[PDB]
């Protein structure tokens, strides 16, 4: 299967990834306001599969710890969203057995949407109010199966976004965790045995987002 390694110690919050996801899928923009933050859209929605969350933490001395979290579906090895949707209808949520992508179909309109979100330990699933379809990151599974990197991975200038075979990406995550701990001692990988989107957090993942880890 495939896997993302996301090294948050390299992220400049340029939000190339957030634009690249919408450009590839031709997703519409939300109506947004500034409410005292660079963060926008403020949350995932039916039309936003990835948003970069900004959190500011004080540190002693000059500056802050500025925490950037480009949030997306984790493509869980054993996805509970599927387990819950499979209660109401099989084929609403499937698994590509080649890539490991967890994929919502048009039959998500025929299952209990709110229950599927509730079963997501990462609170990823989002519901269209008109159609009641569910949307999320789909791993750019079409691009992946046609030799291309996912849009958000290709666009990322810093080396934050990494993608490939799960064995190469786990080995990369381990090797990089050892190096990054030298400068960021509280560095951890997010749920690295359970997910296909493996974040390296520079400190306690919850500081980045309430749902950063299960």
């Amino acid at each position: 299967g495939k896997m993302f390694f996301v090294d948050l110690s390299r992220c400049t919050a340029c939000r190339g990834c957030q634009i690249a996801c919408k450009q590839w899928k031709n997703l519409p923009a939300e109506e947004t306001r500034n409410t005292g933050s660079h963060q926008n859209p403020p949350d995932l929605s039916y039309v936003t599969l990835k948003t970069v969350r900004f959190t500011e933490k004080s540190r002693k001395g000059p500056g802050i710890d500025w925490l950037f979290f480009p949030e997306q579906c984790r493509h869980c090895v054993e996805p509970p969203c599927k387990g819950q949707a499979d209660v109401d209808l099989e084929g609403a949520v499937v698994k590509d057995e080649t890539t490991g992508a967890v994929l919502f179909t048009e039959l998500t309109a025929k299952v209990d949407g709110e229950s599927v979100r509730s079963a997501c330990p990462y609170d990823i699933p989002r519901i269209d109010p008109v159609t009641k379809r569910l949307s999320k990151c789909d791993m750019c599974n079409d691009r992946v199966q046609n030799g291309l990197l996912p849009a958000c991975v290709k666009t990322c200038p810093t080396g934050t976004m990494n993608f490939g075979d799960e064995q190469e990406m786990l080995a990369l995550a381990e090797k990089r965790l050892a190096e990054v701990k030298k400068t960021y001692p509280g560095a951890v990988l997010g749920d690295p045995n359970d997910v296909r989107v493996v974040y390296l957090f520079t400190r306690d993942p919850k500081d980045f987002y309430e749902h950063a880890v299960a």
Binding site: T12, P62, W66
Partner: protein, 967 residues
């Protein structure tokens, strides 16, 4: 197969935003015959490797955008409505406006009765956003029309600091290039927010860190850059010279300078004359009545041949380096810490890390962009960086350089093409009234008697001749010389620049303005004053992608169309991906891009617009006569066109240049019609044309070298990332300028592991050598008169060594280094109702005034509204909560913004008082989006720096007040 791309033609392009020069792939429907369907990164491009920031990444949405101009619009005097109109009408009516204004205002001779052949009732603004071929053509059209008031973007952010690099190294350009950053051992980012403003730069910065590099951010604010550096050092606004002077003292005191480099390749050994002195903040030669220096007091002592004397031992008390040591002894850590607000401990950390790159096996680079360098001593700030780099042996080396980051995708090119008042293309000066012949023009070029000084500018007469032979190939250069307009020798040079253009407009002194690819209604400081002043024009040609605050100033806030007589022609141009041409990035990479989709609707490439507009002026002169027709009538536009259209390919071959007849040059036979293979083979006698001597080598008989997409590298090229076969850089594909300084006098690299060039088997291997000659036979700075990197720079108006003079007028009363508080060769009101230091800056998601990015829904999505960043301390003082609406006011205007309260802004400790900085983006404008807010330039003064002729956008006094809500 991906359905989205299945039947679409793939072409390559170059990002239309910042000067990184990232590569794009464009997919166009119907195998090229349709609209764009996709735009993303070019995986094969060596700079971005397929990565894009949200601006590059949203170019699909910029191009395929139903808000774009569709055809020419017309606004009649006093009219409150646009009138859709044809191209034939618009360009016929404009051709008539030009001729009328020109005829009515042409001066064949000035008051002194000297030949000038110029119009002073037309100005032009723009543009760094145009292709290199369009920039070159546009300048030559304006000059053949006799304009002198020709300005653009570069004047605002770059022209204030470019002299620092020309004085120090002999050229104004960024010394290295983006990939080269990965070779640095210590990266000092100071007056740059590169992670936000040159985002793909951080690919290469973080790769340096991977190989052991220390990343240092020195900035008044904590930014997205600061988050990814090892060291964030806060500096209070305008304390950069003290910061850098302290580093100079530190390097000198601790002998961390690279002696062999300093002795041979800098002017450290040159004997300064007895008339040079510094006391009490003043250099010798000070005329206190006129606040200007007699620079002859700063002259070197000369030998019998007129060559500056040297003590290679560096012992003579009047050796530059001994004078340098004496000058900087005042910049001790306690004084520098007190004025910068940087902790003594953090100063020592940064000084130690950076000065460690004095060792030959380590390289340090300084990255600066605009920062706060627009003020009268900005040029001395950059001088100090250049001096630090010359002391540490960091000029000419991989991972070194002064990386002066360019702003716009083609601001390098647009400067190269002479879209500023004082320069023709190739940095040949615009003649003044006293330069009455070509011979007199050429006599002003300084000569050297030192046989080791290449002094390459001595070749100028070949470049001026070849450039005249490009505009007028049937004329002798000496005759052609009289066709081009001249500035008054008596007049202060800055009277012809950006800010005086606005001042004049507001005095009613211009009939016509071209706002060609600029949004002055938002980009100019003091927007209230400039929006009023545009009313005082008779006519305005605005060429842009969208309707905007400039095209439509007449129906802007508080305006009455009825009362405003300005006739406006809005001419819609096509986006970057809809045309062919080249853009020159910050590293001087001249990169060819191709059309994806055809121009949207009836939009046109700038090239077609300007050529059709001119062709109509030409024929309208051929049938009515009128003022001095010769320049217009004889201008060689044949070479600019193919198939009844502007030809990027043919303009690029003319700019490179070709032999106008059979010529023997440099011991070689060249046939008529052949391309000039290099500026080395240009002549002064009319055998050659070249639109731009820097372009000689870019488009040869081997073909279009700008269009090369070849990643072939030797091991030594690949080790430092020269990519010599990927596009082409001026001059003659020298990727790292001054690279002769990277080797010893035998031609062996100081740092073999990062060799730039190396003498092997009687040749220079690696980069193209910056100056021909056997090892040890030439001084390494070939564009300098004397040939050396200048630690002592006596051409500078403020003195030959940088000295702290307080840029922050209002809150500062004490200079701890001298009795001279302010710049003695350069009045702010400091009204106490405005206690806070206002500043403006960018965010990653928006571009310039936002004219482009406020039309992009994904960028508005991320950054929908003007905001005001303030400290928790200023929040607490003004009872402002995060998300509260606030009113930001100055003497010049007022606006509302959303407060962002953040520890990313801290108070500055100035003379035991907390002084508060207020930050705004200048990306917003009344036209779009709904509720986006207006320009931060409502608040900024026009007043302007006496020296640089640029107003203050980085430190201007404001108040911020909570705008109250219903309980």
């Amino acid at each position: 197969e991906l359905q989205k791309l299945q039947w679409a033609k793939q072409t390559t392009s170059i990002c239309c935003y910042c000067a990184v020069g990232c590569g794009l792939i464009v997919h166009t429907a119907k195998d090229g015959q349709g609209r764009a369907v996709n735009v993303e990164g070019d995986p094969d491009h060596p700079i971005n490797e397929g990565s894009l920031c949200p601006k590059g990444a949203s170019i699909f949405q910029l191009g395929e955008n139903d808000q774009r101009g569709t055809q020419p619009l017309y606004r009649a005097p006093f009219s409150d409505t646009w009138k859709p109109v044809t191209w034939d009408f618009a360009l016929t009516e404009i051709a008539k406006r030009i001729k009328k204004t020109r005829d009515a205002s042409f001066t064949e001779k000035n008051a002194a009765g000297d030949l000038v052949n110029r119009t002073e009732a037309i100005a032009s603004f723009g543009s760094a956003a145009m292709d290199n071929e369009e920039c070159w053509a546009y300048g030559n059209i304006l000059r053949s029309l006799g304009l002198v008031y020709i300005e653009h973007q570069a004047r605002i952010x770059h022209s204030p600091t470019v002299p620092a690099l020309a004085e120090s190294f002999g050229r104004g350009a960024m010394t290295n290039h983006w990939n080269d950053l990965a070779n640095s051992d210590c990266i000092l980012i100071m007056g740059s927010n590169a992670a936000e403003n040159h985002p793909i730069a951080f690919k290469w910065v973080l790769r340096a860190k991977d190989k052991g590099a220390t990343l240092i951010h020195v900035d008044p604010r904590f930014t997205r850059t600061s988050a990814r550096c090892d060291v964030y050092a806060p500096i209070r606004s305008g304390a950069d010279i003290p910061f850098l002077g302290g580093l100079i003292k530190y390097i000198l005191d601790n002998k961390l300078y690279f002696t062999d480099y300093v002795r041979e390749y800098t002017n450290a050994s040159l004997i300064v004359g007895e008339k040079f002195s510094f006391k009490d903040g003043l250099f010798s030669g000070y005329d206190a009545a006129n606040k200007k220096y007699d620079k002859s007091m700063w002259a070197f002592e000369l030998d019998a041949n007129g060559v500056p004397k040297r003590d290679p031992a560096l012992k003579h008390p009047r050796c530059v380096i001994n004078l340098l040591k004496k000058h900087y002894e005042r910049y001790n850590l306690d004084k520098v810490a007190a004025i910068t607000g940087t902790s003594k401990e953090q100063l020592q950390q940064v000084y130690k890390a950076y000065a460690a790159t004095g060792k030959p096996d380590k390289a340090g680079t300084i990255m600066y962009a605009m920062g706060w360098t627009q003020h009268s001593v900005g040029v001395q700030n950059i001088r100090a960086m250049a001096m630090i780099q010359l002391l540490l042996g960091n000029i000419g080396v991989a991972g070194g350089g002064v990386n002066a980051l360019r702003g716009e995708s083609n601001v390098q090119g647009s400067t190269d093409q002479g879209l500023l008042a004082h320069i023709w293309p190739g940095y040949n000066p615009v003649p003044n009234s006293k330069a009455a012949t070509l011979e007199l023009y050429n006599a002003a070029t300084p000569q050297s008697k030192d046989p080791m000084s290449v002094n390459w500018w001595q070749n100028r007469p070949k470049y001026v001749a070849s450039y005249l032979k490009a505009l007028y190939p049937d004329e002798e250069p000496a005759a052609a010389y009289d066709y081009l307009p001249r500035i008054d020798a008596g007049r202060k040079l800055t009277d012809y620049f950006w800010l005086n253009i606005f001042e004049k407009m507001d005095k009613g002194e211009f009939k016509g303005l071209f706002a060609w690819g600029m949004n002055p209604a938002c980009g100019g400081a003091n927007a209230n004053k400039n929006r009023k002043a545009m009313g005082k024009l008779e006519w305005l040609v605005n060429v842009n992608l969208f309707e905007n605050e400039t095209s439509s100033f007449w129906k802007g806030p508080g305006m009455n169309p009825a009362e405003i007589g300005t006739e406006v022609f809005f001419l819609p141009c096509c986006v970057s991906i809809e045309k062919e041409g080249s853009v020159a990035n910050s590293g001087r990479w001249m990169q060819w891009r191709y059309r994806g989709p055809k121009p949207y609707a009836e939009t046109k490439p700038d090239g077609d617009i300007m050529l059709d507009m001119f062709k109509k002026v030409r024929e309208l002169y051929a049938k009515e006569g009128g003022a001095y027709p010769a320049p217009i009538a004889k201008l060689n536009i044949a070479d600019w066109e193919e198939h009844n259209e502007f030809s990027p390919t043919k303009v690029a071959k003319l700019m490179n240049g070709y032999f106008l007849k059979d010529t023997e040059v440099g011991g070689k036979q060249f046939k008529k019609g052949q391309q000039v293979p290099s500026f080395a083979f240009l002549t002064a006698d009319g055998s050659t044309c070249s639109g731009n001597w820097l372009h000689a080598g870019s488009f040869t008989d081997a073909g279009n070298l700008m269009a090369r997409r070849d990643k072939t590298q030797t091991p030594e090229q690949a080790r430092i990332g020269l990519f010599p076969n990927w596009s082409f850089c001026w001059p003659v594909n020298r990727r790292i300028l001054y690279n002769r300084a990277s080797v010893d006098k035998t031609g062996k690299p100081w740092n073999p592991a990062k060799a730039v060039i190396e003498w092997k088997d009687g040749k220079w291997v690696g980069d193209v050598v910056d100056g021909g000659g056997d090892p040890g036979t030439k001084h390494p700075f070939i564009m300098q008169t004397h040939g050396f990197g200048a630690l002592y720079g006596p051409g500078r108006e403020e003195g030959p060594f940088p000295e702290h003079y307080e840029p922050l007028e209002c809150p500062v009363s004490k200079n701890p280094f001298s009795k001279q508080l302010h710049n003695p060769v350069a009045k702010a009101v400091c009204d106490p109702r405005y206690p806070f230091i206002g500043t403006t800056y960018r965010v990653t998601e928006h571009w310039q005034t936002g004219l482009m990015t406020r039309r992009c829904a994904w960028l508005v999505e991320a950054e929908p509204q003007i905001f005001c960043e303030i400290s928790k301390e200023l929040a607490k003082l003004r009872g402002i909560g995060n998300g509260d609406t606030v009113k930001v006011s100055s003497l010049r205007g007022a606006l509302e913004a959303v407060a962002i309260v953040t520890e990313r802004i801290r108070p500055f400790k100035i003379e035991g008082v907390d002084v508060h900085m207020v930050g705004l983006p200048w990306h917003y404008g009344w036209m779009v989006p709904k509720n986006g807010g207006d320009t931060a330039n409502l608040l900024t003064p026009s007043a302007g720096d006496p020296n640089t002729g640029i107003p203050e956008t980085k430190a201007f006094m404001v108040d911020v007040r909570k705008v109250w809500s219903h309980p």
